[PDB]
């Protein structure tokens, strides 16, 4: 199926204490492969999985330099606004930056993103033909003025469409055996009565990859929506994924009501009934 | 890979 | 309020001898690259400065040396001058918004026996 | 030798079309841009190109290819004013550096 390459950037100022506390991250579908750390000693662009420690201290240079000016650029960013909303130095803001690439089954280019965020709001980000910027803000749309006439987006555009896309096609190739892996979801089924009269139906699927799966109830033929609890799907910490879903059910009445497990490493999507 | 050219405000 | 500006604009030296050029961005700059022009033949790159410290470097070697200032200004300094170190040597000044770089008039040195 | 050029002189007769060309090797060349150098000057921008394709600009064309590594630069309605020595120059994904090739000189034959 389809893949991508996103980069997460956070700044967040400190009132006097130095300088921005910078987090950096790199993921290829849902499997971090860089991160750079501003309190770790390192002070370097750092691998984080196996197929990315085949690149040479060429990469690795220019990695660094690279996520050093991403981090220069958010401290003044910072400084900038605090001047257009008229802040403290006595605060403390927050930047956040994202951008990548999407490709189709075959490894071509279907979508390119870039937003930045100020506090927790959306500040400015590109449009997805990649041509122009969304700016809801007054202070955001001076922004939008000066990028425009210095042909931002363009540049943007070239790396999103162009070598974003390259890379995205290295790591692929030399992380095979990692990134185009499916997991199959090894699901079971909990049932504890929550009453007399009545019971909780657990719906669960373990150690999956990649994260996307559905998980909906039926009784019968019809779906319980306004009746299911969903949990946010949760990283095991080994690489794989975890999700839950739960329904109440009337006692006795547990054999109508089937779990529906949607996911790309299964043959077809299973349904499991609470075996007596 | 990252970019290069990324702009200040 | 001005544009790119550098000197000495020239500049004459014996070998072995030590030399130190100035340069400094255009108002709303601050970036700086140096690079060196043999004559007829395209600019090479050195190093650039940003926010006092080196930023990259190109592929010359340890007897080339630079600072850039609080200012943005920079100063090249090269010693051991060789013949072969005649050359324009070429600052330009860049900002971070757009990355276009503009160069500034060159200081010409000329290393004579 | 990582962006090539011929250093001519190419001559070109007053009023007629005039063509220049470069070639790069690095595949990871994103940005490009020709500066214009004059006899015992510094080298002005004339024009960037950041996207593949075609870009006009007043009497100045850029073609750029990278699936073959060419980009040329193409002048209308040559002057006298154009012999100047054109300076192809390319900027990699990996870093701020220009690389810069050898340089083609123009000579507008009046």
């Known amino acids: 199926g389809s893949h991508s390459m996103r980069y997460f950037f956070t700044s967040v100022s400190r009132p006097g204490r130095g300088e921005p506390r910078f987090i950096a991250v790199g993921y290829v579908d849902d499997t971090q492969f860089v991160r750079f750390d501003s309190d770790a000693a390192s002070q370097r662009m750092e691998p984080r999985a196996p197929w990315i420690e085949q690149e040479g201290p060429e990469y690795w240079d220019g990695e660094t330099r690279k996520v050093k000016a991403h981090s220069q650029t958010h401290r003044v960013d910072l400084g900038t606004l605090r001047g257009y909303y008229n802040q403290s130095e006595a605060g403390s803001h927050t930047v956040q930056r994202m951008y990548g690439c999407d490709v189709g089954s075959d490894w071509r280019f279907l979508r390119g993103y870039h937003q930045y965020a100020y506090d927790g709001k959306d500040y400015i980000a590109l449009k997805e033909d990649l041509r122009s910027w969304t700016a809801a803000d007054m202070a955001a749309q001076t922004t939008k003025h000066k990028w425009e006439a210095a042909h931002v987006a363009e540049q943007l555009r070239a790396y999103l469409e162009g070598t974003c896309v390259e890379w995205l096609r290295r790591y692929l190739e030399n992380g095979k055996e990692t990134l185009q892996r499916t997991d199959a979801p090894k699901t079971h089924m909990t049932h504890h009565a929550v009453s007399d009269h009545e019971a909780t139906l657990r719906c669960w699927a373990l150690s999956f990859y990649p994260a996307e799966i559905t998980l909906t109830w039926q009784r019968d033929g019809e779906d319980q929506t306004q009746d299911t609890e969903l949990v946010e799907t949760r990283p095991a910490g080994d690489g794989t994924f975890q999700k839950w879903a739960a329904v109440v059910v009337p006692s006795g009445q547990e054999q109508r009501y089937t779990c529906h497990v949607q996911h790309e490493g299964l043959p077809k999507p299973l349904t499991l009934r609470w075996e007596p | 890979s990252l970019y290069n050219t990324v702009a200040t405000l | 309020d001005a544009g790119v500006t550098q000197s000495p604009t020239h500049l004459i030296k014996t070998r072995g001898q030590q030399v130190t050029l100035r340069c400094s961005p255009k108002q709303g700059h601050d970036t700086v690259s140096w690079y060196q022009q043999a004559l007829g033949q395209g600019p090479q790159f050195i190093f650039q400065?940003?926010?006092?410290?080196?930023?990259q470097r190109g592929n010359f070697p340890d007897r080339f040396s630079g600072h850039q200032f609080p200012n943005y200004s920079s100063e090249l300094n090269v010693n051991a001058l060789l013949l072969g170190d005649s050359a324009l040597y070429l600052c330009?000044?860049?900002?971070?918004?757009?990355?276009?770089?503009?160069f500034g008039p060159g200081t010409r040195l000329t290393v004579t026996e | 030798k990582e962006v090539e050029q011929n250093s001519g002189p190419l001559s070109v007769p007053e009023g007629a079309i005039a063509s220049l060309n470069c070639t790069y090797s690095?595949?990871?060349?994103?940005?490009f841009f020709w500066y214009r150098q004059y006899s015992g000057k510094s080298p002005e921008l004339i024009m960037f190109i950041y996207s593949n394709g075609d870009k006009e600009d007043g009497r100045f064309t850029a073609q750029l290819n990278k699936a073959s590594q060419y980009i040329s630069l193409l002048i209308r309605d040559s002057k006298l004013s154009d012999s100047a020595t054109y300076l192809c120059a390319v900027r990699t994904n990996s870093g701020y550096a220009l690389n810069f090739g050898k340089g083609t000189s123009l000579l507008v034959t009046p």
């Open positions: 400065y940003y926010e006092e410290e080196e930023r």
């Open positions: 330009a000044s860049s900002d971070t918004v757009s990355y276009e770089q503009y």
């Open positions: 690095d595949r990871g060349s994103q940005s």
